[PDB]
Amino acid sequence: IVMTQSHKFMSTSVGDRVSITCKASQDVSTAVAWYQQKPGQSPKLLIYWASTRHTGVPGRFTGSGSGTDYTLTISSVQAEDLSLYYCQQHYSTPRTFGGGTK
Amino acid sequence: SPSDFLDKLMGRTSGYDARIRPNFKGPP
Amino acid sequence: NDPRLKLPSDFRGSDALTVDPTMYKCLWKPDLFFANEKSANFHDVTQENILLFIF
Amino acid sequence: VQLQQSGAELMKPGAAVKISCKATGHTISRYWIDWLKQRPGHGLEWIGEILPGSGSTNYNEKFKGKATFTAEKSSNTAYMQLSSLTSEDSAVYYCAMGVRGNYFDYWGQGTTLTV
Numbered sequence: 001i002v003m004t005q006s007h008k009f010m011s012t013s014v015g016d017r018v019s020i021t022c023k024a025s026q027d028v029s030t031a032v033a034w035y036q037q038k039p040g041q042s043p044k045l046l047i048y049w050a051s052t053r054h055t056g057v058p059g060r061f062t063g064s065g066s067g068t069d070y071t072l073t074i075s076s077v078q079a080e081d082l083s084l085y086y087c088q089q090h091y092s093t094p095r096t097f098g099g100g101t102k
Numbered sequence: 103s104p105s106d107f108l109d110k111l112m113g114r115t116s117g118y119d120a121r122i123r124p125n126f127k128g129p130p
Numbered sequence: 131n132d133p134r135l136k137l138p139s140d141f142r143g144s145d146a147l148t149v150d151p152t153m154y155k156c157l158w159k160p161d162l163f164f165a166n167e168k169s170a171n172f173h174d175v176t177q178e179n180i181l182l183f184i185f
Numbered sequence: 186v187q188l189q190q191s192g193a194e195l196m197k198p199g200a201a202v203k204i205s206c207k208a209t210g211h212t213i214s215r216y217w218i219d220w221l222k223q224r225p226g227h228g229l230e231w232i233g234e235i236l237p238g239s240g241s242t243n244y245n246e247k248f249k250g251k252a253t254f255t256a257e258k259s260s261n262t263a264y265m266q267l268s269s270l271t272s273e274d275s276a277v278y279y280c281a282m283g284v285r286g287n288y289f290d291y292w293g294q295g296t297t298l299t300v
Contacts, residue, residue, distance in 0.1 A: 031287070033288040033289075035289070041294075041295075042279060042292035042293060042294060042295060043229070043289075043292065044292070045288060045289065045290040048286060048288040048290070049286070054290060086228065086229060088229075088288065088289070090283070090286060090287030090288050091287075093243060094231065094245050094246060094247075095231040095287065096230070096231070097228050097229045097230070097231075098228065099227075099228040100228045100229075
């Protein structure tokens with residue numbers, strides 16, 4: 001599987017709606033997770049199975065999509081949402097991520 | 103429709119394969 | 131190994147083919163017993179406890 | 186549950202370094218300990234996994250031989266050894282852990298490597 005994010009850098013103002021597309025290579029159809037890695041720290045988990053949230057995550061992060069085309073969504077961008085966002089498939093054994101979106 | 107609906111929901115017809123989990127190739 | 135269970139080239143999967151545990155009755159299985167057991171026991175508490183992965 | 190790695194590392198080519206992952210909060214032989222690679226310029230990458238009790242490992246096909254997973258229940262720590270270090274190995278190495286799935290919800294602070 002080759003997860004892909006076709007936008008290395010995205011522009012957004014504080015309080016916007018932005019969608020980050022992670023177009024999978026083959027059909028996993030639910031197996032996607034989204035990570036946030038501020039500079040100098042471990043990528044913390046945000047979404048797993050493409051629609052669920054992790055214990056202690058703000059409710060403005062929403063996962064969607066299925067099959068191949070996936071998408072993360074931040075309703076109201078705060079100041080802490082200015083970091084790197086990694087998508088991740090956990091369907092097969094070799095667990096590629098897909099580069100990263102900024 | 104008679105009460106043979108159990109055969110169109112399961113068993114003899116409708117091709118319900120009781121060995122394949124729901125949402126095959128999908129969420130858990 | 132069982133070369134008749136070689137999954138086709140049109141099967142992506144993750145790495146295996148986790149199947150219905152009740153599907154063991156249609157495959158060959160080594161018939162190993164325990165030469166010390168006085169009385170052994172299967173387990174079916176909701177249904178029979180068996181795995182079946184076919185790589 | 187927490188994963189406390191070792192410190193930063195500096196090695197020369199041809200050598201081999203062993204990174205630890207001190208599991209402070211649970212028995213190391215309990216969960217799969219995953220190993221990841223973050224090389225700047227590129228993205229993350231999955232090295233493999235080791236169940237520290239049964240000695241079972243599932244390496245990535247790109248890292249076969251390059252990486253060796255070990256464990257030691259005397260101190261509850263999972264090790265990784267990188268053999269034949271080259272300039273390509275300059276990256277940060279993590280030891281994640283996914284409890285309720287194949288995602289990575291528990292991470293390590295990181296262990297910088299510079300060949």
